Design a protein around this nucleic acid. Structure first.
Ligand code: MG
Ligand code: MG
Ligand code: MG
Ligand code: MG
Ligand code: MG
Ligand code: MG
Ligand code: MG
Ligand code: MG
Ligand code: MG
Ligand code: MG
Ligand code: MG
Ligand code: MG
Length: 114
RNA sequence: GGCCUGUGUGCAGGUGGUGCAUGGCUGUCGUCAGCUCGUGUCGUGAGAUGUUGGGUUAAGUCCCGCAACGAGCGCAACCCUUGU
């Protein structure tokens, strides 16, 4: 089950890979074909994986787990920040901090100070 | 009991040695700005990061990105004097 249509996917252009100069060989099983130095990902595998992620996230919300949203690239900072704020869910989009969750005791005092 | 004159007794007395056993105190590097730790992470391991690189400063002063995030001792200032 998906909520995003194929035509919308192609219009968005999420099927493009990086150029042939920096492509990861491990993504051979996903990249479909090359066309002018650029790669294309297998859309059907994309929908299948999206479906699996959808079921997992549904299970997560079902048993009540908190999800952390992380993204630091310049382009998507505002998008992820707005989406996380609307969902009311912690996030970060400016700069990743060293082991904030792993070393949680130190950040605990930082939160109390805040 | 306070006292001291004599016999003692335990005992006082030593600038006598030993600053390569020691306390305390002190000179220097140098009033130079650097010096450590908690958590985590890389390696296995000595260890490293953090403290780096760009910029800036009298200074580890501050910003930038980074497996680093913070904390401690330093520095700045809090003392005195001088200048209205
Ligand atoms: Mg004597
Ligand atoms: Mg003697
Ligand atoms: Mg001596
Ligand atoms: Mg020194
Ligand atoms: Mg390990
Ligand atoms: Mg280090
Ligand atoms: Mg280093
Ligand atoms: Mg640093
Ligand atoms: Mg240092
Ligand atoms: Mg410096
Ligand atoms: Mg400091
Ligand atoms: Mg000071």
């Amino acid at each position: 089950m998906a909520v995003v249509t194929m035509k919308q996917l192609l219009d968005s252009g999420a099927h493009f890979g990086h150029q042939t100069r920096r492509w990861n060989p491990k993504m051979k099983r996903f990249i479909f074909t090359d066309r002018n130095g650029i790669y294309i990902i297998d859309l059907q595998q994309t929908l299948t994986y999206i479906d699996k992620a959808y079921e997992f996230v549904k299970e997560t919300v079902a048993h009540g787990g908190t999800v952390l949203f992380v993204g630091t690239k310049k382009q998507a900072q505002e998008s992820i920040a707005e989406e996380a704020t609307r969902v009311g869910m912690p996030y970060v989009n400016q700069r990743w901090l060293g082991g904030m969750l792993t070393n949680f005791s130190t950040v605990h005092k930082r939160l109390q100070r805040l």
